[PDB]
């Protein structure tokens, strides 16, 4: 008897999940199966035609659960239909009025907003996080995600999933200025609203953020007075423990900016070990890696961050380009929302905030944007996200491609795609993360698969948003 609940809305109130009264058409397994079955009798052919699903399919439907005594045959069906299935007196089948919980947006809000189960408890993403307030008593639920934006990039990144053959991908974006959570996109995702991963991997999937990190190594190295702006490093390869340091583009030399423009391992290890172990230990919990998101949702995951007293120096390095410690997708977008504000650390959330937001300050103003325009240099000619460049606009990213860890702890050739970063970088409004989990159709670098999937998103949000361009 599953009845009415509050409706889920985005920001602006477009509607997400809404109850609608119904005719649903289910099957009672076990009485079905008990009274003969799916026979030669001509009106199960009838019932097939009339559904317009084979009887294949529907025998399929009610062997499944024999002794079950709830299959669902259709959410919904027209009188005329329905009046022609009930006369049909077939046993086992049966018409009720309900309340169909409906998504309107889909495939693409599914692993946000949930389902229901059977009896019509939510069971998975807001549907289940919100289901005492949604069920009476009864309260509407104002979500803080934005439909249009939603729609740009569950599209980019299910699209770029596809045509990269990836195991998954995920893309979280973030209001700079409130911590809401305006985009919370997956690919593989499902369809709720049919008769048919659905776990919401931005929370559950903990990765090693990679070459990611380093925005924050070059923030504390500034701090600690180890370095400074216009700076130089000797970049050629060296050793740490007897494990060999070198660098994918082979340089003599790098400016600190040239370190997160080339993504230097051996510019960012030469950083960390100039600092004691709890220096970027410090930092990374500072922008909020090892820290619970605290959104509500289920399976939401705050990752694994180190808690050892004693690094080895291979330890120390590998740390510096984001090897030792595991991150949800939403993490790593708060980490380059904090970035994103100057340095102020803003709690999530996905439901509509009123603004102003408090926050705490974790690095001061200057520092931050200091090391925001250095990371305008990836984007820029010379740098390894340029495909991620937009038109009209100055953008701050930093490109990454993770070696995924196994099972057993040894590293597989086997890769995590990113670009995260923020704009406009001469006023950041929007954080975004892309991650493509094991790209294997050719290229696998964060730069040639996921930076472009970042540059379509930001572009449109920017454009949608109605924001000023910036040179
Ligand atoms: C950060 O992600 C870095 N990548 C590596 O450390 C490196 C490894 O983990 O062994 C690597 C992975 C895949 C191919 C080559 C080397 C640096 N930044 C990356 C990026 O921004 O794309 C690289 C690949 C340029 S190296």
């Given at each position: ?8 809305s ?19 397994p ?59 007196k077939?046993?086992g ?109 931005a ?17 504390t ?23 060999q ?36 230990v ?45 991150v ?76 995924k ?67």
């Amino acid at each position: 008897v599953p009845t009415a609940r509050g409706m889920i809305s985005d920001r602006s109130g477009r509607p997400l999940a809404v109850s609608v009264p119904v005719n649903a058409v289910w099957a009672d397994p076990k009485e079905l199966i008990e009274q003969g079955g799916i026979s030669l009798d001509t009106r199960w052919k009838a019932l097939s035609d009339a559904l317009e699903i084979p009887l294949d399919q529907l025998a399929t439907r009610i062997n499944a659960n024999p002794k079950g005594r709830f299959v669902y045959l259709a959410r919904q069906v027209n009188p005329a239909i329905g009046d022609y299935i009930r006369k049909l007196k077939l046993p086992g089948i049966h018409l009720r009025q309900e309340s169909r919980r409906y998504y309107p947006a889909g495939q693409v809000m599914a692993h946000i907003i949930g389902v229901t189960n059977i009896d019509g408890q939510g069971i998975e993403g807001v549907e289940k996080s919100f289901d005492r307030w949604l069920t009476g008593a009864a309260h509407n639920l104002v979500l803080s995600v934005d439909e249009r934006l939603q729609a740009l990039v569950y599209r980019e990144l299910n699209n770029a999933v596809a045509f990269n053959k990836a195991e998954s991908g995920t893309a979280v974006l973030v209001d700079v200025n409130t911590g809401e959570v305006l985009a919370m996109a997956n690919s593989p995702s499902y369809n709720p609203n049919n008769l048919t991963a659905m776990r919401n991997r931005a929370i559950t999937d903990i990765f090693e953020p990679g070459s990611t990190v380093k925005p924050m190594v070059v923030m504390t190295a500034l701090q600690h007075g180890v370095v400074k702006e216009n700076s130089v490093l000797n970049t050629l390869p060296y050793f740490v423990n007897g494990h060999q340091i070198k660098d994918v583009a082979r340089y003599a030399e790098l400016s600190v900016t040239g370190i997160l423009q080339k993504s230097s391992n051996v510019g960012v290890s030469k950083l960390a070990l100039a600092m004691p172990s709890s220096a970027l230990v410090d930092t990374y919990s500072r922008f909020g890696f090892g820290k619970a998101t605290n959104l509500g949702l289920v399976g939401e995951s705050s990752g694994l961050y180190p808690k050892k007293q004693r690094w080895s120096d291979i330890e120390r390095a590998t740390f510096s380009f984001g090897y030792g410690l595991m991150v949800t997708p939403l993490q790593l977008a708060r980490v380059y929302a904090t970035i994103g504000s100057m340095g102020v650390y803003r709690p999530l959330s996905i439901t509509r905030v009123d603004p102003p937001v408090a926050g705490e300050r974790i690095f001061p103003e200057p520092l931050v944007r200091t090391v925001v325009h250095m990371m305008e240099s990836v984007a820029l000619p010379g740098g390894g996200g340029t495909k991620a460049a937009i038109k009209g606009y100055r953008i701050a990213i930093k490109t990454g491609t993770a070696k995924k860890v196994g099972p057993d702890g040894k590293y597989m050739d086997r890769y995590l795609a990113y670009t995260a970063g923020v704009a406009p970088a001469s006023n950041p409004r929007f954080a975004l993360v892309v991650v493509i989990n094991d790209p294997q159709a050719g290229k696998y670098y964060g730069g040639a698969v996921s930076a472009p999937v970042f540059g379509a998103i930001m572009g449109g949000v920017l454009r949608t948003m109605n924001i000023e361009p910036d040179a």
